[PDB]
C-alpha cells in the first residue's frame, strides 16, 4: 500500500555538482558509456545550428570543459538545456543501475516533470530497463538541445544583448511573491493597456507556483521595467532562465514540428507504459501514446502552455486515490526545493503515512579480484626509485645533502665557473654486465649509469622476473627520456631489456623539454591501457664533453644571474597499478592519483606559458582526481631558468591552490609550502622532473620538509609576500606529520618555457597493513649472492654492517630478512649462506665467513646446473609418536594431501588416517594396517612437498616399504594405486596370518661369520630376510629358530638385537597371501618409469615397465631385500657418485647411511625428520646446503604459508665492484 | 576427391549399415537414421581415417542429404 | 555416457561389440561420481562466497 | 598459406608478396612508412608492380 513518484526538475536546479560527480563515476559501465556517447550527439546536433548560434558556442572535447562555463554563467541556452537533461538522465541511470533499484513499474509508480523532465518523463516512461533507455536518452538529449536552440533564437530575435554583456547571459524570468495569480495577471493587463507594446513583447505569466507565489517572464529590459512597478510587500527574484518559454503568443505548432523533426518516423517507437502525471494539460494522466506523440506533447507543454505548478500535488493525490493507495514516497531527481513536496502530496491522502524510513542497502561482497574498479583510471603506485645525484651516490646521501641546505655547485674535478656535476663521473662494474673489461669506455656514461640505477631500483623493489602474474618477462615495458648529446644511447632500454631478460616495449621519447616527464606520463597511460604490468622509467642528463667556457649560475631568490646552473641526474623509478602492487606485497612509497597536461599554445615573447592556461590545467587536474585545493600541502617547481617564469609562476600556481578571498582573508586553512629542487642540485635539463619526483618521495619517506636555500634577501618584486595568503617558506626543518587516519597529498608541476605544463598529484602510500600473525618458525635462513669474489666480499661486509645497526629492532624482523633476501632476489653464481635462530647467531656466522674469505681464501662458483639428488624412502622400522604433525599444521599443501588421502582410503573401505596427524596420541593404539598406511601416506606427502621446493630426483631407492612410495616418485604408479596396494596387502596379511608367530633379528657381522657360527645351513634354520650392508645383516624366521640363532650368536660374542616388528616380511609368514596379492596387483595400472629405480628386490637398477609385472609385487613381498648388490650396481653404473647429494624422505637417516657406506664416506646425506629434533633445523640445513651447492630452490613456495614474514625490507644496495673508465 | 570421397562413402555405409550404392544424392540423413550422435561418430571417423578438417557439426548443420555432404567434401 | 580414467576406460570400451557404437567427448576430469566426492568437496568449492544475509 | 592435410592449394586467391627493399633500398627508420606509401599507391592504381630481385 505505497507508491513511489519520480519527479524531475527544471532549469532552476543547479546541475554543476551532479554533472561533476557523474563524471567522477568509474565503477558503472552504463553511466560511463552514456557519458562518453552524450558529447558525440551534443556536437552532432550542435553542428546543425544557424551560423550565429554556432559562433557563440564554446569549443569543447567533453563535458569536463563545460561545467566551468556553466558555473560562470556564460553558457548559451541551447547547450544549457541539453546539459541539464544529461544531468537528470545520468542521475536516474546511476540511481537505477548502481543503486540496484528496481525500474519503476506501472503497477506502483508514476512519473512527472516540469519545464524539463517532461522531455525526460516520456524517455523514462517508455523503456522498461536501463539498457533499453540509453538510445531513448540520447534521442531526448537531441530533442532538448534543438528545443533550447529554437527558444534561444526566438529570444534573440525579440531582443539583443547588451554592451556590458561580458559573456554572461541575462535572465528572462522572475518569481514574484505576495500577490494572487489572477490579481497579478490583471495588474499586467493594466500595465500593457497603460503602455503600447507589441503583442510579442508584453510580460506574461509563465507559472502559477501557488496562491502565495507566482512566476512572470518577459524581455530583460521589459522585465526590469515591470519589476520596478511591483512595490512591497511583493518580493521579486531573478531566476537563471535565459530564454522565453511557456509563451502562448510566441510559438505555434510549426515550431513544435521543427523541434520534433530530429526523430525519424518508424513503427518501432516504444509505447509509453509507465503513467506520466502532468498538470499543465487538461487530462493529467498520459499512457499509451507512442514515443513521438508523447514527446511532441511534452515539447508543447515546455513551449506553449503555462505550467500550473499549484495543481501538481492535487494531481498526484488524485492518481494515488485512483489506484487506491494511501501514501506516496517522493523520489525527486534534480528537483529544486524538493523537501516541501513530500508533505504537500501526503496532506491530500488519508493520514496513515507509516514512517518506515528504512532501506536495507548493504551491498553484496564483490567477487575476489573484481572488487577493484575497472583498470580505467586506477591509482598508480611507485614501488621504488634509485638514482645518482651530484655530490652524492644514492637517495640517502641526496636526502642528507638536502636537509643541511647546501648548494651542490663546485669546481669541476680535474679527472674529467663552477657547476653541480657528479663527483664520480663514469665508473662501471663491467664484470657484472657480461662485457669485455676493455670495451666499457665505448659505452657512454649515460647508458652505464642508467643500467646501474635500474638494477638498484629493481633490486630495492623486490622484483624478480617470472615469479608473479604481474612481473612477467613479457609484461615489463621500459620508457626512457632522451637528452641532447643498437649499441648506442638509443637502445638504453634495449640494453635493460636484454640484460634483465625483460621482453617488452622500449622507447626513448623526448618532446622538447619534459622528455622524462612525458615518458612517465605515457608509461602510466600504457599501464592504464593494460599493455604492460610493470614499467621502468626515468631519464638521464649526464654530460659527456665538459665544454666549460659568466662567473655565475643563479643568484639567491632572484634572476640577476645569466646562467641556469645545469646539473646531472640518472633517476629511475618502477611503476605498478596499485591493486597489483597491493596484492603482491611490495614497498609502495607513493601514488599518482591523476595526471594531465597541455601545451600552452599562447606565447608572450619567445616561449612562455600563460596564467589562464595554468589556472585551467590546475582546475582540470583537481577536478578529475576529485580533490579540492584545500588538501594540497606542497607543490614543486621544475623551472627553466628564465626571468619572468621562475618568479611569476609562484603567483600563477597559488592563483588556483590558494586564491584570495574577495573580501580579504586566507582561503586556505592549512599552510601551503613551495619548493624548487633546482636550487641546490641544479637544473637537470632532461631529468629535472624525475629529480623533483625523487625529492618528493624522499620527503614523504622521511616525513620532513627541506630548509630552503633560496630566499635569503628581500623578496622579489614579482613575488609578493605570501604570509598573508596562508603560505610561506621555511628557513629550517618543519615537521610534516601524516595526519591521523588521513593522507598528505602533493602536486608536482613543470613550467618548461617550451610550452609544456605537465602536472600530476601525488598521494602517500595506503596505510601499511600491520601483520599480526606470528612466525611459528624457530630457525631461519638468510641467503646472499654475487657474480665476483670482490662483489661477494662487499655484499657480506655490507650485510654485516646492516645487521649490527638493527640488532635491537624487534623479534619479528628476522623472518622478514629471510623472505626479502631469499624469495625476492636473483641468485647469482657466487653464493653464501648463514642460518640461525636469532640475529646474533647469523651475524656471528657471517662475520666468521667473511673473515675466512678475507684471510686469502679464493671464491669458487657452483656447477652449472646444480647438484643431482638421489631420494631414499625408509621402511616401517623407525616410526615414532608425532610424525611431523608440525608439517601438517604449518603447510597447506601437506594438509590438503593428507585430507585427500584420508578421503580416498575411506572410499576404498580402508581405515582413516587423519587422526594419526592430528591428535599425536593414537600412535600407541594403531593397527598394523593403519601403521603402514600412515607410513606410505606420509612418505608420499613429504616427497611431494620436497619436490615443490625445487628438488628433482635423479634416482630413487626404497627399503621394503618405501618401495611403494619410491615407485610413485618414479611415476610408475598413481597415488591411488599405491594406497590401494599397501592397504589391501596389509588387510590380506592381517586376515590370513596370526600375530607374533614369527619375528626378526638384526646382526652386525659378516654373512660368512653368521653362517659359520650357527648350526644348520641357512634356508631351513634361518633366512637372510634383508642384506643391509657389509657388516650389517638381518635375519627372520620362527620363534624357535630365532631364539636358537640368538643363543648361538650371542654365545659367540656377537651382539644381536631383536626387532619389535610383530610381523616379519620376507619370511615364511607371508607365504599364504601371494595369490590374493597378485590378484589385487594385476588390477593396478603400471607405467614406464620416468627416472631409474634402484630396486633392491631384484638387486638391479630398473628402467623399464617390463620388470614391474604384477608378479614383481609378489616377488618383492616374498623374496629378501638385497641392498648391497643393487647399490654396488648403481655405483658401477655411474648413476650414483661421490658428488650427488643423498636425501632421505622418512623418519631418520637409515637408508642414507647405507648409501654413504656403499658409495664413499665423503658423500653428503640429509634427513628431513628426526625423533628429537624440530623439523625446521633440518629443513634449513638441507636447504642451505642445496643452495650453496648450486641448486635453484623455489623459495617463494617456502614462505607462502607464513603471512607474518611477507614484507620486503630495505637491504643495502648491491656491492658493485667499482672500476673506473673514462674516455 | 574421388578416392577420398569413396572412402568417406565406405565409412558412411559402415556406420549407417547401408550399402555404397544406396547412399545416393536424393537420400536424406533423416531417412538414413543418421542420428546426432551418429553424426559425431561419422565426423570423428572421417577426420581419423581421411584426415580432413571437418567440424563435428557441419554434417548436421549443413548436410541434410548426401549431395550437400558430397559438395562439402569437394573442397 | 560412461566415464573413468582414460586407461581403464579404454580397456572397458574394447570389450564392446560392433552394434554398440562409441565415441569420445571433450571431458578432462571425472564428474557425477557419488563414490569419489563427498559433502566436504561441495563445501570447499562453494566456500568462496562470503556469508551474508542479502 | 595453409597447406591441405591431404596436400593441395587451400588458399584460393593468389597471395602476392612484395618488398620495397630492392627498388630503393632500406631507410632503417622510414622503411615502414615507405612500404605503407607503396601500399597506398598500389591501392590507388589497383596494380601489383613487377618484382625485382631475380
Curated annotation (Swiss-Prot), chain C:
Induction: Expression is positively regulated by the cercosporin cluster-specific transcription factor CTB8. Expression is also affected by nitrogen and carbon sources and pH, and is also controlled by another transcription activator, CRG1, previously shown to regulate cercosporin production and resistance. Disruption phenotype: Abolishes the production of cercosporin. Does not display any pigmentation. Leads to fewer necrotic lesions on inoculated tobacco leaves compared with the wild type. Multidomain protein; including a starter unit:ACP transacylase (SAT) that selects the starter unit; a ketosynthase (KS) that catalyzes repeated decarboxylative condensation to elongate the polyketide backbone; a malonyl-CoA:ACP transacylase (MAT) that selects and transfers the extender unit malonyl-CoA; a product template (PT) domain that controls the immediate cyclization regioselectivity of the reactive polyketide backbone; 2 acyl-carrier protein (ACP) domains that serve as the tether of the growing and completed polyketide via its phosphopantetheinyl arm; and a C-terminal thioesterase (TE) domain that facilitates the release of the final product from the enzyme. Polyketide synthase; part of the gene cluster that mediates the biosynthesis of cercosporin, a light-activated, non-host-selective toxin. The perylenequinone chromophore of cercosporin absorbs light energy to attain an electronically-activated triplet state and produces active oxygen species such as the hydroxyl radical, superoxide, hydrogen peroxide or singlet oxygen upon reaction with oxygen molecules. These reactive oxygen species cause damage to various cellular components including lipids, proteins and nucleic acids. This is Non-reducing polyketide synthase CTB1. It comes from Cercospora nicotianae. The chain holds residues 219 to 272 of 2196 of the full protein.
Amino acid at each position: 500500500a505505497q507508491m513511489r513518484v519520480v519527479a524531475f526538475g527544471d532549469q532552476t536546479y543547479d546541475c554543476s555538482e551532479a554533472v561533476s560527480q557523474l563524471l567522477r563515476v568509474r565503477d558503472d559501465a552504463i553511466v560511463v558509456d552514456f557519458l562518453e556517447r552524450a558529447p558525440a550527439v551534443l556536437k552532432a546536433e550542435l553542428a546543425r545550428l544557424s551560423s550565429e548560434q554556432q559562433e557563440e558556442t564554446p569549443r569543447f572535447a567533453t563535458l569536463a570543459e563545460l561545467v566551468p562555463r556553466y558555473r560562470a554563467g556564460t553558457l548559451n541556452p541551447a547547450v544549457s538545456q541539453a546539459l541539464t537533461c544529461i544531468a537528470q538522465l545520468g542521475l536516474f541511470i546511476r540511481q537505477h543501475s548502481s543503486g540496484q533499484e528496481a525500474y519503476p513499474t506501472a503497477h506502483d509508480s508514476c512519473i512527472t516533470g516540469v519545464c524539463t523532465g517532461a522531455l525526460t518523463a516520456v524517455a523514462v516512461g517508455s523503456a522498461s530497463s536501463v539498457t533499453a533507455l540509453v538510445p531513448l536518452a540520447l534521442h531526448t538529449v537531441a530533442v532538448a538541445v534543438r528545443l533550447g536552440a529554437r527558444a534561444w533564437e526566438i529570444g534573440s530575435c525579440l531582443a539583443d544583448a547588451r554592451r556590458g554583456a561580458n559573456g554572461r547571459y541575462a535572465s528572462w524570468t522572475s518569481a514574484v511573491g505576495g500577490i494572487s495569480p489572477q490579481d497579478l495577471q490583471d495588474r499586467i493587463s493594466a500595465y500593457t493597456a497603460e503602455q503600447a507594446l507589441a503583442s510579442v513583447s508584453v510580460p506574461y505569466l509563465s507559472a502559477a507556483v501557488g496562491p502565495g507565489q507566482s512566476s512572470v517572464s518577459a524581455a530583460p529590459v521589459i522585465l526590469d521595467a515591470f519589476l520596478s512597478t511591483l512595490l512591497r510587500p511583493l518580493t521579486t527574484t531573478r531566476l537563471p532562465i535565459t530564454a522565453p518559454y511557456h509563451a502562448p503568443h510566441l510559438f505555434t505548432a510549426k515550431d513544435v514540428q521543427h523541434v520534433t523533426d530530429c526523430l525519424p518516423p518508424s513503427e518501432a517507437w516504444p509505447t509509453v507504459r509507465i503513467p506520466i502525471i502532468s498538470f499543465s494539460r487538461d487530462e493529467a494522466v498520459s499512457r499509451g501514446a507512442s514515443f513521438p506523440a508523447a514527446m511532441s506533447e511534452a515539447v508543447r507543454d515546455c513551449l506553449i502552455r503555462p505550467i500550473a505548478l499549484d495543481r501538481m500535488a492535487v494531481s498526484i493525490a488524485n492518481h494515488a486515490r485512483d489506484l487506491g493507495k494511501d501514501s506516496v514516497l517522493p523520489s525527486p531527481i534534480a528537483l529544486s526545493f524538493s523537501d516541501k513536496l513530500g508533505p504537500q502530496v501526503n496532506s491530500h491522502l488519508p493520514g496513515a503515512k507509516a514512517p518506515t524510513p528504512e532501506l536495507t542497502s548493504k551491498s553484496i561482497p564483490s567477487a575476489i579480484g573484481a572488487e577493484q574498479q575497472p583498470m580505467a583510471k586506477s591509482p598508480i603506485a611507485i614501488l621504488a626509485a634509485s638514482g645518482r645525484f651530484p655530490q652524492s651516490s644514492s637517495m640517502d646521501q641526496f636526502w642528507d645533502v638536502l636537509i643541511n641546505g647546501v648548494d651542490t655547485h663546485e669546481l669541476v674535478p680535474p679527472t674529467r665557473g663552477f657547476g653541480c656535476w657528479l663527483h664520480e663521473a663514469g665508473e662501471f662494474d663491467a664484470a657484472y654486465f657480461n662485457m669485455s673489461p676493455r670495451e666499457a669506455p665505448q659505452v657512454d656514461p649515460a647508458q652505464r649509469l642508467a643500467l646501474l640505477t635500474a638494477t638498484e631500483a629493481l633490486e630495492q623493489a623486490g622484483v624478480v622476473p617470472n615469479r608473479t602474474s604481474s612481473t612477467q618477462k613479457n609484461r615489463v615495458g621500459v620508457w626512457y627520456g632522451a637528452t641532447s648529446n643498437g649499441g648506442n644511447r638509443a637502445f638504453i632500454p634495449g640494453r635493460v631489456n636484454y640484460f634483465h631478460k625483460f621482453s617488452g616495449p622500449s622507447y626513448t621519447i623526448d618532446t622538447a623539454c619534459s622528455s622524462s616527464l612525458a615518458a612517465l606520463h605515457m608509461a602510466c597511460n600504457a599501464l592504464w591501457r593494460g599493455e604492460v604490468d610493470t614499467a621502468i622509467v626515468g631519464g638521464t642528463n649526464v654530460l659527456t664533453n665538459p665544454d666549460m667556457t659568466r662567473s655565475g649560475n643563479c643568484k639567491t631568490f632572484d634572476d640577476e644571474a645569466d646562467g641556469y646552473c645545469r646539473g646531472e641526474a640518472v633517476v629511475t623509478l618502477i611503476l605498478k597499478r596499485l591493486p597489483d602492487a597491493q596484492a603482491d606485497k611490495d614497498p609502495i612509497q607513493a601514488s599518482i592519483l591523476g595526471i594531465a597536461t597541455n601545451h600552452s599554445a599562447e606565447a608572450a615573447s619567445i616561449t612562455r606559458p600563460h596564467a589562464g592556461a595554468q589556472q585551467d590545467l590546475f582546475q582540470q587536474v583537481l577536478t578529475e582526481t576529485g580533490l579540492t585545493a584545500n588538501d594540497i600541502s606542497v607543490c614543486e617547481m621544475a623551472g627553466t631558468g628564465t626571468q619572468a617564469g621562475d618568479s611569476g609562476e609562484t603567483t600563477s600556481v597559488v592563483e588556483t591552490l590558494a586564491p584570495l578571498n574577495r573580501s580579504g582573508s586566507a582561503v586556505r586553512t592549512t599552510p601551503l609550502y613551495i619548493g624548487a629542487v633546482k636550487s641546490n642540485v641544479g637544473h637537470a635539463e632532461s631529468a629535472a622532473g624525475v629529480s623533483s619526483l625523487a625529492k618528493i618521495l624522499l620527503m614523504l619517506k622521511h616525513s620532513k620538509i627541506p630548509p630552503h636555500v633560496g630566499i635569503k634577501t628581500k623578496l622579489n618584486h614579482r613575488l609578493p609576500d605570501l604570509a598573508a595568503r596562508n603560505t610561506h617558506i621555511a628557513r629550517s626543518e618543519v615537521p610534516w606529520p601524516r595526519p591521523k587516519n588521513g593522507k598528505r597529498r602533493v602536486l608536482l608541476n613543470n613550467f618548461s618555457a617550451a610550452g609544456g605544463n605537465t602536472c600530476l598529484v601525488l598521494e602517500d602510500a595506503p596505510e601499511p597493513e600491520d601483520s599480526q600473525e606470528v612466525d611459528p618458525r624457530e630457525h631461519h635462513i638468510v641467503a646472499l649472492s654475487a657474480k665476483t669474489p670482490d662483489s661477494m666480499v662487499n655484499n657480506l661486509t655490507n650485510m654485516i654492517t646492516w645487521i649490527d645497526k638493527h640488532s635491537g629492532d624487534s623479534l619479528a624482523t628476522l623472518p622478514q630478512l629471510s623472505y626479502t633476501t631469499t624469495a625476492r632476489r636473483v641468485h647469482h653464481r657466487h653464493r653464501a649462506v648463514a642460518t640461525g635462530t636469532d640475529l646474533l647467531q647469523i651475524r656471528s656466522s657471517l662475520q666468521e665467513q667473511l673473515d675466512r674469505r678475507v684471510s686469502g681464501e679464493r671464491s669458487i662458483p657452483h656447477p652449472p646446473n646444480g647438484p643431482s639428488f638421489v631420494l631414499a624412502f625408509t621402511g616401517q622400522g623407525s616410526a615414532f609418536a608425532g610424525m611431523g604433525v608440525d608439517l601438517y599444521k604449518r603447510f597447506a599443501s601437506f594438509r590438503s594431501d593428507i585430507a585427500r588421502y584420508d578421503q580416498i582410503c575411506e572410499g576404498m573401505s580402508l581405515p582413516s588416517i587423519k587422526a594419526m596427524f592430528e591428535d599425536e596420541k593414537v600412535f600407541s593404539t594403531a593397527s598394523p594396517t593403519l601403521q603402514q598406511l600412515t607410513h606410505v601416506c606420509f612418505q608420499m606427502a613429504l616427497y611431494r612437498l620436497w619436490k615443490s621446493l625445487g628438488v628433482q630426483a635423479k634416482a630413487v631407492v626404497g627399503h621394503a616399504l618405501g618401495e611403494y612410495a619410491a615407485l610413485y616418485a618414479a611415476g610408475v604408479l598413481s597415488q591411488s594405486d599405491t594406497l590401494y596396494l599397501v592397504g589391501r596387502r596389509a588387510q590380506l596379511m592381517e586376515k590370513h596370518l596370526s600375530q607374533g608367530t614369527h619375528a626378526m633379528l638384526a646382526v652386525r657381522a659378516k654373512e660368512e661369520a653368521i653362517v659359520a657360527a650357527i648350526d644348520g645351513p641357512p634356508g631351513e634354520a634361518y633366512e637372510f630376510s634383508c642384506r643391509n650392508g657389509e657388516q650389517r645383516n638381518v635375519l627372520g624366521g620362527t620363534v624357535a629358530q630365532i631364539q636358537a640363532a640368538k643363543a648361538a650368536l650371542e654365545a659367540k660374542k656377537i651382539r644381536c638385537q631383536y626387532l619389535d616388528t610383530p610381523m616379519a616380511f620376507h619370511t615364511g609368514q607371508v607365504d599364504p597371501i601371494l595369490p590374493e596379492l597378485l590378484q589385487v596387483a594385476a588390477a593396478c595400472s603400471i607405467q614406464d618409469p620416468q627416472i631409474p629405480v634402484i630396486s633392491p628386490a631384484y638387486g638391479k637398477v630398473i628402467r623399464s615397465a617390463k620388470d614391474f609385472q604384477p608378479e614383481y609385487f609378489t616377488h618383492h613381498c616374498r623374496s629378501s631385500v638385497n641392498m648391497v648388490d643393487a647399490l654396488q650396481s648403481a655405483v658401477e653404473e655411474g648413476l650414483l657418485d661421490k658428488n650427488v647429494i643423498g636425501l632421505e624422505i622418512g623418519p631418520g637417516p637409515v637408508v642414507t647411511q647405507f648409501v654413504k657406506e656403499a658409495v664413499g664416506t665423503t658423500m653428503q646425506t640429509f634427513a628431513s625428520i628426526n625423533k628429537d629434533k624440530d623439523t625446521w633445523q633440518l629443513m634449513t640445513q638441507a636447504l642451505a646446503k642445496f643452495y650453496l651447492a648450486g641448486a635453484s630452490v623455489e623459495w617463494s613456495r617456502y614462505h607462502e604459508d607464513f603471512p607474518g614474514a611477507q614484507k620486503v625490507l630495505e637491504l643495502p644496495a648491491y656491492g658493485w665492484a667499482l672500476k673506473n673508465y673514462w674516455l | 576427391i574421388g578416392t577420398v570421397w569413396r572412402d568417406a562413402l565406405k565409412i558412411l555405409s559402415e556406420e549407417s549399415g547401408l550399402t555404397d550404392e544406396e547412399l545416393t544424392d536424393d537420400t536424406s540423413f533423416a531417412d538414413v537414421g543418421v542420428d546426432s550422435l551418429m553424426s559425431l561418430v561419422i565426423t570423428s571417423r572421417l577426420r581419423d581415417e581421411l584426415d580432413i578438417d571437418f567440424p563435428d557439426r557441419a554434417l548436421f548443420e549443413e548436410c541434410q542429404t548426401i549431395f550437400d555432404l558430397r559438395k562439402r567434401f569437394s573442397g
